[PDB]
Amino acid sequence: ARPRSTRGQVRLPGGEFAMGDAFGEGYPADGETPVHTVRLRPFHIDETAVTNARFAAFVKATGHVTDAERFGSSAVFHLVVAAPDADVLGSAAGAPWWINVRGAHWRRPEGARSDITGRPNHPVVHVSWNDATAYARWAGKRLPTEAEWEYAARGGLAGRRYAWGDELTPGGRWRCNIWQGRFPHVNTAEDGHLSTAPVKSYRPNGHGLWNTAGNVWEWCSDWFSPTYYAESPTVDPHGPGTGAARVLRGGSYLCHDSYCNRYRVAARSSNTPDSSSGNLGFRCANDA
Ligand SMILES: [Ca+2]
């Protein structure tokens, strides 16, 4: 391990909390139930998702090549594709709004005709689980467990639907970056952002974490299993020992009811560790 750094991290006391979907709003294969008691020891977690600027420092220091670069392409939402026609490789068979764009990666998130010069304080995207874990190691940190992630995101509140409470738009107003309008064709940007927002935007939750709901998906250390909640230990669960996909949490700027409720604090998903997309980043953590 590199010398530890809790820079840009808040220390949370842990303790017991009720992990899982209280409301039964996820779909069966997500395994958000049963609601089960988890006991966490005190730990540190990034107040924000990792930014473009910090990931640049990592790459400058290490020469890290991301999976998206190695594979040669990454998934870009159809509306923002900024590339020559020859770099469009085809849409995702299952999700036609996801475009496979040659050369799309963290530096050029919409393809070769894009850059991040205006987005240093935006979350880094097109980063795989591998990229995320490599960053954390150089940075003197780790990824949070899924349990740590949910605890931190709940912000000291018990059994709420969202990081801040049960109403999605309290007082009719937005405090997270998701999708409003006719998905996947029209984004009304009611929440003030079409694509990613700065990592500190809106306001923090009760634990001082910003944007755990929406903006970008966030990789956790755990292997995903839809039955793990039923077989989880009480103290510091790390997920199952083997698996195919790693856990991601939070939902993104592309989330809308019609197909997605993933901004709920208890919502969970997963992806193969080497996968990447323009709506998927991460935040780091540490033991106390
Ligand atoms: Ca938005």
Curated annotation (Swiss-Prot):
Q: Which Pfam families has this protein been placed in? A: FGE-sulfatase
Provide the residue positions that the database annotates as binding Cu(2+).
255, 260
How cofactor binds (record note)?
A: The catalytic copper is required to activate oxygen and catalyze oxidative C-H activation.
User: What's a GO biological-process term for it?
Assistant: post-translational protein modification
A molecular function annotated in GO for this UniProt entry is: calcium ion binding
EC numbers: 1.8.3.7
Question: Do you know which SUPFAM superfamilies this protein is assigned to?
Answer: C-type lectin-like
Q: Does the keyword DNA damage apply?
A: no
Instruction: Cite the effect that the entry attributes to residue 255 to S.
Output: Abolished formylglycine-generating enzyme activity
Q: In which pathway does it act?
A: Protein modification; sulfatase oxidation
Which keywords are on file for this protein? Calcium, Copper, Metal-binding, Oxidoreductase
**Reaction equations catalysed:** L-cysteinyl-[sulfatase] + 2 a thiol + O2 = an organic disulfide + 3-oxo-L-alanyl-[sulfatase] + hydrogen sulfide + H2O + H(+)
Top class in the EC scheme = oxidoreductase
InterPro entries referenced in this protein's UniProt entry, alphabetically: CTDL_fold (IPR016187), Sulfatase_Mod_Factor_Kinase (IPR051043), SUMF_dom (IPR005532), SUMF_sf (IPR042095)
Q: Which domain of life is it from?
A: Bacteria
The cofactor named in the record is: Cu(2+)
Binding of Ca(2+) occurs at: 177-178, 191, 193
UniProt similarity note: Belongs to the sulfatase-modifying factor family.
Its annotated function is as follows: Oxidase that catalyzes the conversion of cysteine to 3-oxoalanine on target proteins. 3-oxoalanine modification, which is also named formylglycine (fGly), occurs in the maturation of arylsulfatases and some alkaline phosphatases that use the hydrated form of 3-oxoalanine as a catalytic nucleophile.
**Descriptive protein name:** Formylglycine-generating enzyme
